Design a protein. Structure first.
Ligand SMILES: CC(=O)Nc1ncc(CN2CCCCC2)s1
Ligand SMILES: CC(=O)Nc1ncc(CN2CCCCC2)s1
Lengths: 461, 461
């Protein structure tokens, strides 16, 4: 059994019924199997873990759990008590049991305990009863695990849940030592790789962590997450993980973008990655191509954009220029991966800085010929980004469009300011006009009190 | 019978089941009665009005309609065919009937036809069969109205749906003349006032439009809408409409912010406005105070923010500094109304521009005393905005917080750049440091390709 699929475990707006049901559908049809319920901002999942779900809240989870059964997806309910739990207090342990009993009754059969993103410091009482932090955690986990009849799928998430989080390091951790020794063998351990958001999950570090936890980990992959508060979006393919990891892991769950529809690629490409070495035994990648996987994903995703007779003298059917595969390929390029822009977007950035760097060449002859030859192709590229923004804003699927609309609006806005600036640079040996940010539309014509103040900031001078 | 409540009729992400059910609950408990279903981006409502709803889409609308019945809210289903309908084609009229029949079968008993935001130009075929645009519309409306058994609640939305939209004007419109004459008397007419987003709906213009349409209109009020693409947010009270309008109107439906939870005030204050002259006969406001209505709203809304034993040596319960009424009063002030900032936010803006205007007074004696006395109180105000941002970002209710989080983040970001700038101005007669936008956090530490480009724009120089 290999757990593969999605963990809804980011900070931000939790997905709704409509979205989650749609996720289960897509997961089923791409042959994935797992959904881990972990919304950091489902108040009763973390913050107020003690509270029972209300009647309305209960009917919803039951429906949610039912749908997962209907689409053959295993629903794992996670709880995160580590913010304010007194481990040594028996009333606490009892409440944790009570909570997980409510969810069992809702129809859930697979559970997880999470101790991620909390501090190491125990309280006084706990420090008397427990040797270390790991000892407190493992004790309560094991107890819960056994109390629930030792379910087939039970997960544990460490506090030291990734390479950079282990004191003093991975292979010599007192915390991970305890976990790998004392935690019952029927329980899975979640791991994210070298870092929270791992650029690569090298096979070496998987063997390294495998040794100390004394089992194969389940990846909680944060490759596509965007909950870090400087809004980005990742539509690139699943990269950085060798298919050789598959036979060395108990599972891979991906914690994708907060915006739901922005996750087609992320989840699609993971399924392709998983299916490429589904059965393979234990032995850059010889089985999986991120470039070819992104293409397959975008090809199928395009079909999600499409539309669901009149006489020559009658009114023409509502229609607009269709979104093309090339449009999407450009979209993904511009909103690629956390550690890597796409080729064309990266190239546009180089070009813009070169043009601005060498703009003296046109201020007051062979460099002049190269500069213009480059500023031409740059404006021609800026034009394509606008082109595909417009086709995107016109498509039939409004749900997909509005999930990433603010991102698309931002880059569209910048490109035009950038295009104007290049034009204005290219015309200064025959123009006396001074460039100002306060002359544009996204800066000088911005709404709200926030904008009124922004215009008064020292822009240009 | 007075129709009062909400129209979901904006451009953007349509609300979901969870949100709409919550709306019905709140509407019921505030003694409102109506919900008009009009999402411009429900693809099968406008764009592809011909298409039947799918089985999945049907179960959802049935549930939605059922919930409205459960909370005693009248569900009105609207359709907008005016983008590509051939009025004269009998196959078209038949499809419009077929569509509205599906929805009737879902349990809906009240309907609306919308012809808002389309051009006046008919096609060739229609121009032969119909005298004018209004003639085409009224013909199809009347037909539908009668075919559905002349329902108790049927609405019509004009193309010339507001003052500024009538050629050549309101009282002398050929379009409105036809509508007021030919449109059956059992049908309501929607009106938004002098403009799309009316600052005021003067009693005079209501009598003016009443005469030509030959009936009392139902207001489709856009006071709180924010779908115009330069993101603002309106948490101010329902203002600009005299309670004298109530006995001169058949209804008021409000088309509020796209962000659902951002609409407590908007809908609350409307209920207060409506209840203040519920029964009153036909005779600045002597019955309703926007200031007192906003206070009542924020007072009750605060209760929506609240949280749903340990020994001295145990772990303290998770807690944080609570959101206060004064916090909300400040929040509403900063995100007030479309034509009006709140007092404190407006005052902060004046102060900032005065300080920047008179910053020479501290560049190289009595003005110096006034400037510092003012720059002090400004920084003290900037500090409060941060203060309440933080309390807000810490509250129990994550759904409310994340609905307006991007707005709150933007203003919070600007305030700090502004605070730094004032500080930097106040210290230049004893400092050699030059101010740069590219030194800050929201400009020089911004994520994504969009940011990389933004840093290369001519900021400061
Ligand atoms: C165990 C584990 O990985 N927990 C997580 N919670 C949320 C995540 C995504 N995001 C990454 C960037 C920083 C904020 C959080 S990762
Ligand atoms: C008849 C009527 O008012 N229709 C509407 N559709 C949407 C509305 C809100 N918003 C106002 C500002 C411009 C964009 C649209 S108003």
């Amino acid at each position: 059994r290999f757990l593969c699929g999605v963990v809804e475990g980011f900070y931000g707006r939790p997905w709704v019924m409509e979205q989650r049901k749609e996720l289960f559908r897509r997961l089923q049809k791409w042959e994935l199997n797992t959904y881990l319920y972990a919304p950091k901002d489902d108040y009763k999942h973390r913050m107020f873990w003690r509270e029972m779900y209300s009647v309305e809240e209960a009917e919803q989870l039951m429906t949610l759990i039912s749908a997962a059964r209907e689409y053959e997806i295993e629903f794992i309910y996670a709880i995160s008590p580590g913010l304010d739990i007194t481990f040594s207090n028996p009333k606490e342990v009892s409440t944790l049991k009570r909570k997980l009993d409510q969810v069992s009754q809702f129809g859930c059969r697979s559970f997880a305990l999470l101790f991620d993103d909390i501090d190491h410091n125990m309280c006084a009482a706990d420090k008397e009863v427990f040797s270390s932090f790991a000892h407190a955690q493992v004790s309560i986990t094991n107890e819960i695990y056994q109390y629930l009849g030792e379910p087939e799928t039970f997960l544990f998430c460490p506090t030291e849940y990734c390479g950079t989080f282990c004191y003093p390091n991975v292979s010599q951790s007192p915390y991970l030592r305890t976990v790998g020794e004392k935690l019952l063998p029927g329980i899975e351990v979640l791991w994210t790789g070298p870092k929270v958001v791992s650029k690569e999950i090298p096979v070496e570090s998987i063997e390294e962590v495998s040794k100390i936890i004394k089992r194969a980990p389940v990846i909680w992959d944060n490759i596509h997450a965007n909950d870090y508060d400087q809004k980005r979006l990742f539509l690139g393919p699943y990269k950085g993980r060798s298919t050789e990891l598959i036979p060395r892991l108990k599972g891979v769950l991906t914690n994708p973008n907060c915006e739901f529809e922005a996750n087609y690629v992320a989840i699609h490409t993971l399924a392709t990655w998983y299916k490429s070495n589904m059965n393979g035994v234990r032995k850059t990648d010889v089985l999986y191509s991120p470039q070819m996987a992104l293409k397959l994903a975008l090809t199928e995703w395009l079909q999600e954009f499409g539309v669901p007779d009149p006489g020559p003298n009658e009114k023409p059917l509502y229609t607009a220029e269709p979104v093309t595969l090339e449009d999407l390929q450009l979209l993904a390029d511009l909103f690629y991966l956390p550690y890597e822009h796409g080729p064309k977007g990266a190239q546009m950035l180089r070009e813009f800085q070169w043009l601005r760097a060498n703009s003296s060449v046109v201020s007051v002859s062979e460099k002049i010929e190269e500069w213009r030859s480059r500023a031409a192709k740059f404006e021609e590229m800026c034009g394509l980004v606008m082109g595909m923004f417009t086709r995107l804003s016109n498509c039939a699927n409004r749900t997909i469009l509005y999930d990433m609309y603010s991102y698309v609006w931002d880059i569209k806005s910048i490109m035009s300011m950038v295009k104007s600036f290049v034009q204005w640079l290219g015309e200064r040996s025959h123009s006396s006009a001074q460039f100002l940010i306060g002359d544009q539309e996204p800066w000088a014509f911005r709404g709200g009190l926030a904008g009124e103040f922004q215009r008064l900031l020292p822009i240009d001078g």
